[PDB]
Design an enzyme around this catalytic site. Structure first.
Site, mmCIF file in Angstrom:
data_model
loop_
_atom_site.group_PDB
_atom_site.id
_atom_site.type_symbol
_atom_site.label_atom_id
_atom_site.label_comp_id
_atom_site.label_asym_id
_atom_site.label_seq_id
_atom_site.Cartn_x
_atom_site.Cartn_y
_atom_site.Cartn_z
ATOM 1 N N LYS A 168 44.603 -1.418 23.818
ATOM 2 C CA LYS A 168 43.287 -0.882 23.474
ATOM 3 C C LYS A 168 42.613 -0.251 24.687
ATOM 4 C CE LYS A 168 42.799 -4.251 19.785
ATOM 5 N NZ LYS A 168 43.543 -3.241 18.966
ATOM 6 N N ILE A 182 39.768 -8.232 17.112
ATOM 7 C CA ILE A 182 39.880 -7.785 15.731
ATOM 8 C C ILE A 182 41.320 -7.328 15.550
ATOM 9 C CG2 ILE A 182 39.141 -6.115 14.002
ATOM 10 C CD1 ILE A 182 36.392 -6.056 15.635
ATOM 11 N N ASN A 193 41.716 -20.491 23.493
ATOM 12 C CA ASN A 193 41.573 -20.426 22.037
ATOM 13 C C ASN A 193 41.621 -18.970 21.583
ATOM 14 O OD1 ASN A 193 41.308 -23.185 21.170
ATOM 15 N ND2 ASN A 193 39.229 -23.221 22.010
ATOM 16 N N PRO A 207 38.319 -6.610 22.038
ATOM 17 C CA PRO A 207 38.805 -7.915 22.471
ATOM 18 C C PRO A 207 37.772 -8.456 23.459
ATOM 19 C CG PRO A 207 40.203 -6.076 23.232
ATOM 20 C CD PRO A 207 38.814 -5.563 22.936
HETATM 21 S S1 LIG Z 1 36.980 -7.510 19.954
HETATM 22 C C1 LIG Z 1 37.507 -6.303 21.014
HETATM 23 N N1 LIG Z 1 37.111 -4.960 20.808
HETATM 24 C C2 LIG Z 1 36.349 -4.734 19.605
HETATM 25 C C3 LIG Z 1 37.184 -3.791 18.778
HETATM 26 C C4 LIG Z 1 36.306 -2.776 18.030
HETATM 27 C C5 LIG Z 1 37.171 -1.788 17.276
HETATM 28 C C6 LIG Z 1 38.058 -2.548 16.178
HETATM 29 C C7 LIG Z 1 39.187 -1.607 15.650
HETATM 30 C C8 LIG Z 1 40.050 -2.272 14.579
HETATM 31 C C9 LIG Z 1 39.540 -2.467 13.297
HETATM 32 C C10 LIG Z 1 40.340 -3.070 12.320
HETATM 33 C C11 LIG Z 1 41.641 -3.474 12.627
HETATM 34 C C12 LIG Z 1 42.146 -3.278 13.908
HETATM 35 C C13 LIG Z 1 41.348 -2.671 14.890
#
Ligand SMILES: S=C=NCCCCCCc1ccccc1
Ligand SMILES: S=C=NCCCCCCc1ccccc1
Ligand SMILES: S=C=NCCCCCCc1ccccc1
Lengths: 114, 114, 114
Positions: C32, C64, C97, C1
């Site tokens: 997270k 994500i 946003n 994030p």
């Molecule tokens: S932007 C913020 N941090 C970056 C996240 C990197 C790992 C994504 C994990 C993830 C992948 C696919 C679905 C859910 C979670």
């Protein structure tokens, strides 16, 4: 509606009233009340456009709706016009990214517009 | 294609030629003439990555096409490589957001690319 | 994030530890680990909100996943809360946003999260 302009034009070259003019003209163009329009001008940036650093701008317009083929052409004419008139930036050295935001993805006042 | 890097690395640590190198290498990577490419570097930012203020970067690459799984991996290798070499930023302290823009949603020269 | 705040509040009014607080609060809110979280605060900006230059903020939260109607409402209450408490910005002068990023469109460590 939120309009951001990043430019290598110096702060001193941004004229009095520019944020107000942008606000007023965006209200006219988007149909939204000025009370909900946000504008952000970022001068003195380290930028190049086409490999050169003559005056240029990279901009964005976020809006919940009022984004589309013909509308964006109209916005571009308006916004390039203002950047050329007020900041002396050539329209062919301006990019403007348009974003049609879902109301659920715009936060405001402890909630969202959904 | 438009590339922006925001970093907490100070201005004085951005080497001469950096905007030009970014332009050249993006032209090579996207297969587009350098006249089309815009680059924007924003040093001295108040940033944290993983809660730490060690050198880091938050970047974006907007492009009308030339965005996708394998291409983005290639761009990331290129751009992390440049940030590591030139700004001494560890690739694992870099995020690059990729945006596939519709031609109708990019303004330029009083109009759009639609 | 990744959370970015652009504000016309002066640098000196950004409290020490603000970036760390944002990191910890976003970590809890998104579920997270803080190692994943990037934060970027940009004070002293030339901004208007509703035609006025009282304290305001334009923000973005890229993630994500973990983006959606109810989640965004929760983030907005949280983030407006922090901005009001720490930067003295009224929640009705804050826009945030929200962007749900595909893993393939986020570069990191010479590759992407795909
Ligand atoms: S932007 C913020 N941090 C970056 C996240 C990197 C790992 C994504 C994990 C993830 C992948 C696919 C679905 C859910 C979670
Ligand atoms: S992005 C930009 N602004 C964010 C959302 C604006 C909603 C306008 C509310 C509103 C519009 C028209 C008439 C009455 C009320
Ligand atoms: S962003 C950067 N530079 C802007 C490029 C403008 C030309 C788009 C060509 C183009 C149009 C439609 C599909 C593929 C390519």
């Amino acid at each position: 509606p939120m309009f951001i302009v990043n430019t290598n034009v110096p702060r001193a070259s941004v004229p009095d009233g520019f944020l107000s003019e942008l606000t007023q003209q965006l209200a006219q163009a988007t149909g939204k009340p000025p009370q909900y329009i946000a504008v952000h001008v970022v001068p003195d940036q380290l930028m190049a456009f086409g490999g050169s650093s003559e005056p240029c701008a990279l901009c964005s317009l976020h809006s919940i709706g009022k984004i589309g083929g013909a509308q964006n052409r109209s916005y571009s004419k308006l916004l390039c016009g203002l950047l050329a008139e007020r900041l002396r930036i050539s329209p062919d050295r301006v990019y403007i990214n348009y974003y049609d935001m879902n109301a659920a993805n715009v936060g405001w006042n402890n909630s969202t517009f959904a």
